[PDB]
Design a protein around this ligand. Structure first.
Ligand SMILES: Cc1cc2nc3c(=O)[nH]c(=O)nc-3n(C[C@H](O)[C@H](O)[C@H](O)COP(=O)(O)OP(=O)(O)OC[C@H]3O[C@@H](n4cnc5c(N)ncnc54)[C@H](O)[C@@H]3O)c2cc1C
Ligand SMILES: O=c1nc(N2CCCCC2)sc2c(NO)cc(C(F)(F)F)cc12
Length: 429
């Protein structure tokens, strides 16, 4: 079913109309690409549309919806390998793999993302400093390339260059049809978590520098970006690891792999004490929602960037520029990222990662451009999955291996068959 449809990112801006093919037939998808390879607005895959930007739309072009390709082919507990269609979402995968004592190795902050989208944006999670990003756990993928052929890529094979170009490649090397992922063994669906509350930016940084991070596989913090210094950058830090069966309480040991406001006090000293109490704890047993999606149970601009580890002073500065700006962000996530991977367009690098969420109002666009500049000057970068407004020139300087990447893309799609709004804006075409 080919249908002219109006598509936007999760942020619901920069709308664009395209011919949306939605089919469960992989043979239909190979033909639509062959067709597009004849006649020149190109094609692009789309997952669940959870990316905020314009990387999954192609104005006046073809957009292939991959979510009907959602078959899990096999799960093997001994090898820890799952073999799945690209349109399988990580929530679906999570529930399918638990009974085998397997855990999805990298989870983002929403489980409604496809494997293809997980690979194409090379997503990260609370465990990046211990496990890397999603691409590090893919052992193979089958990629529908511009020549109508389906190539079988692996991280260390002869096609390693193309594999790593596809990881974080935002769909611009072809369609990931199928992949094999190595899962993390687990005896439990639960976490054991430690909580800590800091009073300032310099404490937060101290906590993340003292060596405690190495004792936790998962870590992230809620972060104050409004309150002026000294309060600026105080945080609720939440850290932990998957629980073993031995560490669960009686009630949960029979089904260990299961899954199924303001008052007058709030802003005074009693609230400060209460919040400090609630956010301080040791060895709390917690399920996925409680630990990983604590938010559970349009008109905003999402902005995420990472600054190199060494440039700690420069990070403090950027955070100060944000609270002084008049633009207030209430929901902020902070994390120290670990080592990077071989993918040239992969976002994560070791250093200070922060996500902020600004209300759309007058002055924002021009303030965010100036932020881009500070982020660039300080050796950091923005995340494509959260962006629709940065310039090609900024992007290119932020990702110095883009040229290396462009070369790989030139060989595999010399006719520019795969294209998107983002590719044209960021001049990756
Ligand atoms: C509330 C929320 C929280 C989030 N938290 C995080 C987080 O913690 N960490 C993180 O890293 N990201 C996070 N994200 C971003 C999200 O993980 C990525 O945007 C992800 O790529 C979206 O997956 P999707 O399946 O919706 O892909 P879409 O948004 O539909 O597409 C995204 C990109 O993947 C490509 N693509 C999709 N399918 C295929 C395929 N089969 N073959 C080739 N290319 C394909 C598209 O062409 C496009 O370039 C979050 C997003 C939201 C809305
Ligand atoms: O857990 C997360 N939840 C998020 N969302 C749900 C709550 C509301 C806003 C979106 S965003 C996010 C980001 N930024 O993208 C980074 C990290 C990380 F650094 F990996 F720890 C975690 C999250």
């Amino acid at each position: 079913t080919t249908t002219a449809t109006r598509l936007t990112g999760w942020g619901r801006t920069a709308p664009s109309v395209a011919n949306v093919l939605r089919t469960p037939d992989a043979e239909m998808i190979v033909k639509a690409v062959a067709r597009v390879a004849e006649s020149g607005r190109g094609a692009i895959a789309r997952g669940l549309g959870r990316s905020y930007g314009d990387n999954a739309q192609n104005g006046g072009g073809l957009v292939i919806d991959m979510t009907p390709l959602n078959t899990i082919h096999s799960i093997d507990a001994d090898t820890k390998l799952v073999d799945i269609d690209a349109g399988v979402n990580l929530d679906q995968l999570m529930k399918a793999a638990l009974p085998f004592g397997l855990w999805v190795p990298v989870l983002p902050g929403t489980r409604q993302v496809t494997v293809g989208g997980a690979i194409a944006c090379d997503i990260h999670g609370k465990n990046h400093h211990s496990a890397g990003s999603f691409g590090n756990h893919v052992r193979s993928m089958d990629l529908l390339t511009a020549d109508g052929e389906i190539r079988h890529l692996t991280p260390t094979g002869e096609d390693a260059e193309l594999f790593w170009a596809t990881v974080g490649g935002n769909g611009l090397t072809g369609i990931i049809m199928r992949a094999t992922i190595e899962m993390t063994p687990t005896s439990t669906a639960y976490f054991i978590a430690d909580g800590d509350v800091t009073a300032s930016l310099d404490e937060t940084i101290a906590l993340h520098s003292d060596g405690s991070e190495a004792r936790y596989t998962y870590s992230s913090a809620w972060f104050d970006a409004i309150s002026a210094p000294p309060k600026l950058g105080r945080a609720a830090v939440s850290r932990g690891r998957l629980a073993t069966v031995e560490q669960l309480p009686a009630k949960l040991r029979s089904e260990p792999l299961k899954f199924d406001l303001a008052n007058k006090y709030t802003f005074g000293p009693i609230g400060e004490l209460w919040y400090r109490k609630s956010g301080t704890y040791r060895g709390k047993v917690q399920n996925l929602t409680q630990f990983y999606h604590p938010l559970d149970m349009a008109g905003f601009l999402q902005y995420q960037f990472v600054i190199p580890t060494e440039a700690v002073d420069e990070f403090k500065k950027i955070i100060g520029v944000i609270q002084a700006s008049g633009h207030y962000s209430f929901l902020n996530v902070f994390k120290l990222f670990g080592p990077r991977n071989q993918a040239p367009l992969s976002f994560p690098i070791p250093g200070w990662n922060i996500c902020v969420d600004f209300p759309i109002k007058d002055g924002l666009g021009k303030f965010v451009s100036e932020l881009d500049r500070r982020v660039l000057e300080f050796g950091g970068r923005l995340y494509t999955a959260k962006d629709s407004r940065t310039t090609a020139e900024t992007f290119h300087a932020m990702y110095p291996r883009v040229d290396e990447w462009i070369s790989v893309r030139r060989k595999v799609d010399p006719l520019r068959v795969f294209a998107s709004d983002m590719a044209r804006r960021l001049e990756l075409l």
